[PDB]
Design a protein around this nucleic acid. Structure first.
Length: 568
DNA sequence: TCGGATGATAACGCTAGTCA
DNA sequence: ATGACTAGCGTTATCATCCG
């Protein structure tokens, strides 16, 4: 029913895209091979084994999502081969002779994205297209194959986005591109802060700077490097590392996944800029957002409004929505047009008037007519509220409301929050993750009362009463900052603070807090004689506004650590 | 690194038995 | 007097960094 198409994570070999397209063309050598060999010899389950060989024998080839993708196991190494695509493609080292459900879903998304495979909602099945057919038949290495692929690419909005981002001839990194790809600052579109990354890459021992290169990247950064990799093979972009001088002086770090645009690339843009209709599917308008439905369609309707009309006032736009079923607000409506613009659709702006200067092919909005019945969640409502109140603070930072609620995002929250304290509140300092460092070190340098703070961030799903084990971790650090013995924690993280600081507070940042945040807090305070506090993301934000507006200093806050919860 | 690979998680949805 | 519904809990869609 609800699926996510349009965004492709894993897949990188065109070599394998073909095999997957071909499995859909009865007359191709691979259709033959996968069906006659691959499937019967790799799908151990007899029942399924036979069933698939069969589906592949029909006259009019049509396979369902499950028939092509299958399933997978919790312990990825113990998984069997349950589907057509799995069976078609091989492991990285031939560990098993097949790929998993995830990578398989990946090849499906990629092929559908480039328009070789069509999706039939009703049946939840897919079938080859005219260009797919033509793609298969094309010879490998063909100038035809190339032109077929290049024309495919030009119809893929997010790939036009990468190209656009590099018109000026800059050398952008997967982080710079990531920032502006897709619905940025949302559940499935989070990006790693290049600042923090380079910094650690710099002051960190070699025994770890490799792991932290291959590992450090958000979901949007993955898409960026990947779409950038396709364009590279197609010759429209040039992938090359970018060195950075980060004096820890005249030091040099590097981010390999960086790109520059080419001439052929520029020609592509010129053409596909109106000087090739783009395909857009509703499933593309949001990936991992818990509120996929509401938002994907609200945005779909907005695109409809803009396709139909031409140069409307954001008020006219708001107006139309109110009629189609969605009573929204300027802040949200603009934010969505920010995403649509980001995924690669060309929408022009003149003050308070917007006009789509692009040709996108008509698409379907599932369960239409019942649109007016779609409810807006409490979280999405909160977001608007925030988007409304936050005048000085970039709306990107509203992503924190989400990350902080995601248990899988401990890593990045540590990064995003220190970033907010620094770039907005203005504190000086550093992010310090680890098992021997508190999540962050913060310090003032201007106030009449110059102080420091020890920070710990915690991504916890719906609620958080400061656990005793975690609470004491802080005590340890609070303590180490006093007894600065290098024979105790020889990494000497305390050394991040200016020698001159003496006033240190301790702080915990999370989604929401409950019933414990005071008990172990008061404890910590009494023990080390350092008073600290507990703080939530919403307040962190509506504190960043205040510090910017003029409504809040960096002293009233130092006077906020009341061994309880901070509230501005 | 390249091109995926991994264990996790929340929404889904199937069963079996309640609710109206 | 039986279809509509759902607590419980195994299944599926989808990550968000990871890694051989």
């Amino acid at each position: 029913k609800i699926r996510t198409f349009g965004w492709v994570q894993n897949p990188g070999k065109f070599e394998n895209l073909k095999r997957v397209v071909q499995v859909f063309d009865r007359n191709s050598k691979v259709h033959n091979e996968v069906k006659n060999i691959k499937i019967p010899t790799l799908v151990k389950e007899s029942k399924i084994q036979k069933e698939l060989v069969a589906i592949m024998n029909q006259h009019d080839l049509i396979y369902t999502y499950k028939e092509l993708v299958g399933t997978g196991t919790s312990i990825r190494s113990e998984a069997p081969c349950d589907a057509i695509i799995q069976a078609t493609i091989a492991d990285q080292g031939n560990k098993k002779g097949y790929i998993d459900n995830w990578s398989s879903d990946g090849f499906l998304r990629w092929a559908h994205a480039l328009g070789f495979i069509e999706y039939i909602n009703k049946s939840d099945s897919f079938v080859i297209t005219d260009v797919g057919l033509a793609y298969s038949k094309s010879a490998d290495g063909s100038a035809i194959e190339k032109e077929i692929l290049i024309e495919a690419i030009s119809s893929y909005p997010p790939a036009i986005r990468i190209l656009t981002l590099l018109e000026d001839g800059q050398h952008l990194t997967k982080f710079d591109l990531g920032k502006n790809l897709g619905f940025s600052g949302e559940s499935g579109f989070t990006s790693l802060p290049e600042g923090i990354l380079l910094d650690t890459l710099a002051n960190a021992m070699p025994k770890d700077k490799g792991e932290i290169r291959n590992n450090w990247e958000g979901s949007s950064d993955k898409y960026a490097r990947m779409i950038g990799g396709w364009l590279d093979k197609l010759g429209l972009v040039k992938q090359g590392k970018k060195e950075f001088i980060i004096p820890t002086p005249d030091n040099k770090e590097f981010i390999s996944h960086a790109f520059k645009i080419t001439g052929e690339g520029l020609k592509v843009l010129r053409r596909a800029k109106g000087s090739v209709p783009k395909r857009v599917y509703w499933e593309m308008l949001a990936t991992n957002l818990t509120d996929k439905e509401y938002v994907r369609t609200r945005r779909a309707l907005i695109l409809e409004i803009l396709i139909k009309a031409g140069s409307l006032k954001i008020e006219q736009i708001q107006d139309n929505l109110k009629k189609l079923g969605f009573d929204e607000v300027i802040e949200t409506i603009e934010n969505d047009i920010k995403g649509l613009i980001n995924t690669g659709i060309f929408i022009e702006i003149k003050g308070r008037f917007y006009q789509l200067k692009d040709h996108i092919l008509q698409f379907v909005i599932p369960n239409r007519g019942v649109t007016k019945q779609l409810v807006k969640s409490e979280l999405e409502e909160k977001k608007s509220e925030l988007r409304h109140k936050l005048k000085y603070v970039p709306h990107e930072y509203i992503e924190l409301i989400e990350i902080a609620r995601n248990s899988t995002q401990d890593r990045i929250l540590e990064m995003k929050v220190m970033e907010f304290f620094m770039k907005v509140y203005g504190y000086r300092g550093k992010h310090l993750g680890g098992s021997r460092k508190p999540d962050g070190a913060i310090y003032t340098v201007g106030s009449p009362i110059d102080y420091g703070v020890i920070v710990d961030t915690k991504a916890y799903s719906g609620g958080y009463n400061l656990p005793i084990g975690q609470a004491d971790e802080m005590q340890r650090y609070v303590e180490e900052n006093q007894t600065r013995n290098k024979h105790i924690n020889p990494n000497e993280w305390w050394k991040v603070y200016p020698s001159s600081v003496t006033e240190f507070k301790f702080l915990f940042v999370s989604g929401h807090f409950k019933g414990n945040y005071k008990a172990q807090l008061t404890r910590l305070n009494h023990i080390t004689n350092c008073n600290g506090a507990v703080l939530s993301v919403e307040e962190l934000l509506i504190g960043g506004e205040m510090i910017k507006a003029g409504t809040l200093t960096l002293e009233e806050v130092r006077r906020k650590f009341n061994n309880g919860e901070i509230n501005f």
